[PDB]
């Protein structure tokens, strides 16, 4: 019920890394090329980076705010992995360590870090608010699960549009989608996740009390590179030079200088992935609004 | 399981003890029963089913293992914490009546469904003597061995279960009530135990 790795295959990939070689042909700091496929309705985003394929679905509904924060909206997210991405995922295991760590990283990146404008999702204080839900569907697993899922959710929230609501004192009328054009969600910053996989050609003893750092770090590992991984690190940055969130627990205990180096290497990656999502969203908007140049109302004078 | 929308609220509105005894009428389990009691402004209607004995795979116990479970029916839904409390008291009684040494490496599962508990004016004290008389009829219908019939009675919260024509007590339960009411509460249930004891035999011998 688990992936069997032969001793010959395990030895080959490790020695290939000691010679600056990866089976897929990338570099030690080369992120996989990302592709965004927008669906029909708003909030339907399909992300394809490498052989890893993920699909996100954004929805929302009226719900009660928290008693401790009545001026903010809710953000729900659940990433249940089906046997579609691989027969090693037992269906119905929502408490899996991968599913748990994935949701908590994206939840910190979007909700806690202030990516989604929760204060703008408040309709009436302490009674009515928006509860935006992010359903992530893992289609084909080949490493970089939380890297692609974070790209899918961020591309989905920026592509989704919530229904329009007019407040008449205490009443709330949800305008049909055909009545009024839906309003897009407010996004403050764009958190992008970059994971790092670590290997040691030595052993655990030569790593605890060893000054010579012989660790090998690769950016965005594949499934075979992930199964042979020793230590794991996940950082999240934005184009504003801000560290959104960092999660490193277990594996090879690394030093502070290398972790700071991982962030500076990841910033050049998130900076390019950010401008791609901004460009691919611009191209998808012109696809739906072809004659948008004639329908402009606010026009300059002379 | 639908449960409907969470925005909906439930409705808010501002001497002689008749008895009915039955058994069988169930094909899933081996033995079942149905007791009904209507007296004063309170009615009781619960169904008991005994799914056993079932051989346990990989077990090596010297005697059987009884599993009693009370499940909320459709009216007067009690709290789940008190349902298992009475079940643990029911297991403490039937572990001395059912011949455990006869069924090694096997367990017996009991299912009592308090379907219709109604009051017309602790409320669970009045229902305990009716649950004991329903399991004994169901355990005997399943061909399981029991050392003498087991019954109980109520005497203002105090519930005492006797055996061997009331000579020896098998269980004791008391909630609310008063103080120093012991010998009178015992005799009020001792004569009530015999009222339920011979009535179970009269229903179990008919055809």
């Amino acid at each position: 019920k688990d992936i069997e790795i032969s001793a010959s295959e395990s030895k080959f990939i490790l020695e290939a890394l000691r010679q600056n070689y990866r089976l897929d042909g990338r570099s030690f700091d080369q992120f996989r090329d990302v592709e965004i496929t927008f669906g029909k309705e708003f909030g339907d985003v399909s992300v394809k980076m490498g052989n890893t394929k993920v699909h996100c679905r954004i929805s929302c509904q009226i719900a009660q705010p928290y008693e401790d924060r009545p001026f903010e909206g809710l953000f729900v997210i659940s990433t249940e992995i089906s046997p579609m991405a691989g027969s090693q995922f037992e269906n119905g295991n929502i408490t899996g360590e991968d599913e748990v760590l994935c949701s908590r990283i994206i939840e910190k990146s979007v909700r806690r870090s202030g990516a989604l404008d929760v204060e703008g999702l408040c309709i009436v204080a302490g009674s009515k608010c928006w509860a935006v839900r992010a359903d992530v569907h893992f289609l084909d697993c080949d490493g970089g699960f939380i890297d692609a899922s974070c790209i899918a959710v961020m591309a989905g929230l920026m592509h989704f549009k919530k229904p329009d609501i007019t407040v008449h004192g205490e009443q709330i009328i949800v305008h049909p989608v055909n009545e009024r054009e839906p309003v897009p969600l407010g996004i403050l910053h764009i958190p992008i996740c970059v994971t790092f996989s670590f290997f040691n050609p030595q052993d655990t003893e030569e790593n605890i009390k060893g000054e010579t750092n012989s660790e090998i770090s690769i950016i965005d590992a594949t499934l075979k590179e992930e199964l042979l991984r020793d230590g794991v690190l996940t950082v999240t940055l934005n184009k504003n030079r801000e560290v959104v969130q960092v999660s490193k627990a277990g594996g090879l205990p690394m030093d502070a200088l290398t972790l700071m180096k991982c962030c500076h290497e990841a910033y050049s990656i998130i900076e390019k992935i950010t401008d791609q999502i901004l460009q691919l969203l611009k191209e998808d908007s012109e696809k739906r609004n072809k004659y948008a140049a004639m329908l402009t109302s606010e026009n300059a004078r002379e | 399981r639908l449960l409907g929308p969470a925005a909906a609220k439930p409705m808010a509105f501002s001497s002689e003890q008749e008895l009915s005894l039955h058994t069988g009428f169930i094909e899933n389990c081996n033995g079942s029963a149905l007791v009904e009691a209507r007296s004063l402004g309170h009615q009781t209607s619960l169904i008991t089913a005994v799914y056993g004995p079932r051989s346990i795979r990989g077990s090596f116990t010297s005697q059987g293992t009884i599993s009693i479970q009370l499940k909320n029916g459709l009216l007067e839904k009690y709290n789940t914490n008190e349902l298992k409390e009475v079940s643990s008291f029911l297991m403490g009684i039937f572990n001395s009546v059912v011949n455990l040494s006869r069924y090694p490496k096997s367990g017996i599962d009991i299912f009592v469904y308090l379907t219709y508990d109604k009051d017309l004016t602790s409320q669970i004290s009045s229902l305990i003597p009716h649950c004991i008389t329903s399991i004994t009829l169901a355990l005997a219908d399943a061909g399981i061995e029991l050392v003498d019939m087991a019954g109980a009675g109520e005497a203002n919260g105090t519930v005492v279960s006797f055996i061997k024509n009331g000579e020896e007590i098998v269980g004791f339960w008391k909630d609310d009530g008063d103080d120093e009411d012991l010998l009178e509460c015992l005799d009020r249930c001792k004569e009530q135990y015999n009222r339920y004891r011979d009535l179970m035999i009269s229903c179990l011998m008919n055809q």
Binding site: T95, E97, V100, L101, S103, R104, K108, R112, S113, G114, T204, E205, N207, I208, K209, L233, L237, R241, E242, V243, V244, Q245, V246, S247, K248, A249, G250, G251, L252, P253, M254, D255, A256, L259, M260, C263, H264, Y267 | -
Partner: protein
Amino acid sequence: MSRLEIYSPEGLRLDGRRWNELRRFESSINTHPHAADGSSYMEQGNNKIITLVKGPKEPRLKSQMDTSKALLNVSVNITKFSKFERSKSSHKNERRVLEIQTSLVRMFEKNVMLNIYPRTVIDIEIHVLEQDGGIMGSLINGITLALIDAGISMFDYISGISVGLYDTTPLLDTNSLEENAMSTVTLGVVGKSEKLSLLLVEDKIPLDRLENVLAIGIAGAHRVRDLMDEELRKHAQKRVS
């Protein structure tokens, strides 16, 4: 409380400490010689954590058993009375708790010599009686001192320290009031080194400030190691003599 000064121009925080000062550290070893083989009552500030280590022993079922190493289980239970307002939720099966439980297992399964104890399981039971900011770091120091009491072979100490960044001023050992007003970073330093077995950042931090926060973080973690080490010296010397 109310609207307090987090870091005044006089360098004093809301509780009186300064930027590089720690809360009082009073650890206790072998507090449950009748409930577990390892015991540690961690009292870091207002925090009061009970950590038990039951093992290494045979697993209750032969289903899950690694014939080449040991199984490390961590059970973090946040009591309802951990804070002032009694918790109404369940806390036990919370998704935030499962992340902490897993992050602790990965952190120590690489530091604990599970190979020395094959075909065995090590159960770690944690009960938080009271919390007040920096609860993750205090969970770290409790497990370290509890395994040592159980006689489990480890490579080095694992220290838990919490650091906050208020504008342009790092703050060591953040309490609850400080975590609700700035970003928080919990570190997991190994011994007197700079090797990090844990690095949790849960709030936005500028990249130009994170390196200095990490340096001041690992520096305070070494100070946490000595306080635990000096506790074991005093406990071992009074036990032998």
